[PDB]
Every structure is written in C-alpha cells, then in structure tokens.
Ligand binder design. Structure first.
Ligand SMILES: NS(=O)(=O)c1nc2ccccc2[nH]1
Ligand SMILES: [Zn+2]
Length: 257
C-alpha cells in the first residue's frame, strides 16, 4: 500500500490514514533555542543488560531487529515516563546520500540516519493495545552522522546481505543494543506519533542530543537493501524517512541546560 516513492510516499498517506494531518504527528523539527530546559525531568533509565534479540526482518520499509518482549528483559523507564516500557524492536531511517535520512531534525539540520528503539507500556499488556493509548509507546531516537565506524553496529550491517528483499528474515540472537548508544543520555522529549502508518498518536518521543558516528561503509550497506520482494525490479531501500510535521500545540522539553 504505502511506501516512500512519489506515488505512495508521505504526501499520500493521509488518504488511507487521515490521522496523518492530526494534532500530534511526528517527526518534528527540534528548535534548540525554543525547547525549554525542564529541571523536573529525570535521567533516563535504559536497562538493556538482559535484552534478548531474536530475529532481523526486512519488512519492505526498513529492517527491524526484534526482541523477546514476553517479559521485562530490556526496559526504558524514568526521563518523562511513568511506568515501564519494554523494548520490542529497533530500526533505522536513512537517506540516499549523507545530507538527509533522519526524521527528526535539529534547527533544520538533517542527519544521515536515525535509529528508533521502540518500547511499549507494560500497563497495557501487549503492543497492539498500547498503540491505542496516548501514553502507550516510548520511542528512543538516536541520530547517526557519518565519520568513524560504530563497532556495535557492525553485526547488523554484516547480516543485511541475507535479508536483501521484502519479507526476508534471519536469526539475530545475542545482539547487544547497548553498543548503539552514545555516551550522553541528555535528551529532548515531546508527545507525538508513529512515523509510519498507522501513524497512531501514542508515542512519548525521547530524542538523544548526542549522535552516534557510523562509517560511510556502514551506511552504504544500508543503502544496498531493497524495498522490493525477491526477483522483483530492484528499488533500493533509501530515503525511508518521513519529513518534519507541524509542531502545533506542543512543547519540546530538554533534559539538559
Ligand atoms: N518509526 S516509529 O515511529 O518508531 C514506528 N514504530 C512502529 C512500530 C509499528 C508500526 C509503525 C511504527 N512506526
Ligand atoms: Zn522509525
């Protein structure tokens, strides 16, 4: 149905998903001068010691690294959140070239890519119930810039040749998502939405200020994936990002001065 092309891309999504033009859509531009430091925000708690990765899937839009979320093994708490959010998957958005790819922007700056660690509020029992609630998800967003390689990303890039096309998956056990984090957990936070259909308005966004660096070779390998299925005309999986949406009646808070 939807995708990232001229005929089925973000400017078309509202026809099937009218909430695309809602009051709390993501991503947004983060204006660093306007975001207010909120000394009442807590440090984030990222508890991934017990994370259990299982599988990696090309879903025709991005690739998802999936976790066992059947118990509290990898959780996000604290920061602007009440309660416990279980890691279910992470994925990335990236560009055809290094000057674009991120969904959030910072003073209109686009990064080469953006990692989203998606977590759901355990008070709602399962992910499908959580996405129906305004506090159902917390997505931790991390920007990628191109420079030095990120050692903890190389196991993901190494497997991508085995999931080149839509619907392919590969065993992906024992991957430690702690190796994707930057040093600082300073962040911005605001209420928003999933950035792909169904675009539901159920996310507390937590976007880290410090980007991680990845190498040119690492991001080149992302761009060799395919949106299409096996044997279909090749369409490189590039520019799978939604542009910034109107901020409307929202405030972006900073955890840091
Ligand atoms: N790009 S995202 O907002 O992190 C996101 N996670 C998602 C999980 C399921 C369906 C749509 C999604 N969109
Ligand atoms: Zn995403």
């Amino acid at each position: 149905h939807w995708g990232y092309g001229k005929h089925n891309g973000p400017e078309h999504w509202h026809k099937d998903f009218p909430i695309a033009k809602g009051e709390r859509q993501s991503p947004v531009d983060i204006d660093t001068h306007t975001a207010k430091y909120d000394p009442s925000l807590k440090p984030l708690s990222v508890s991934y010691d017990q994370a259990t990765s299982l599988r990696i899937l090309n879903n025709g839009h991005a690739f998802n690294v999936e976790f066992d979320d059947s118990q509290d093994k990898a959780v996000l708490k604290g920061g602007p959140l009440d309660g416990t959010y279980r890691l279910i998957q992470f994925h990335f958005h990236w560009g055809s070239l290094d000057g674009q790819g991120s969904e959030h922007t910072v003073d209109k700056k686009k990064y080469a890519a953006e990692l989203h660690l998606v977590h759901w509020n355990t008070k709602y029992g399962d992910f499908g119930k959580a996405v129906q609630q305004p506090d159902g998800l917390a997505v931790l967003g991390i920007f990628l810039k191109v420079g030095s390689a990120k050692p903890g990303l190389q196991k993901v890039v190494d497997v991508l040749d085995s999931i080149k096309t839509k619907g392919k998956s590969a065993d992906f056990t024992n991957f430690d998502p702690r190796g994707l984090l930057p040093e600082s957990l300073d962040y911005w936070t605001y209420p928003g939405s999933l950035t792909t259909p169904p675009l539901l308005e159920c996310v507390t966004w937590i976007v880290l200020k410090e980007p991680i660096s990845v190498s040119s070779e690492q991001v080149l390998k992302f761009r060799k994936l395919n949106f299409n299925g096996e044997g279909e005309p090749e369409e490189l999986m590039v520019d799978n990002w939604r542009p910034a949406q109107p901020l409307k009646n929202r405030q972006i808070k900073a955890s840091f001065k």
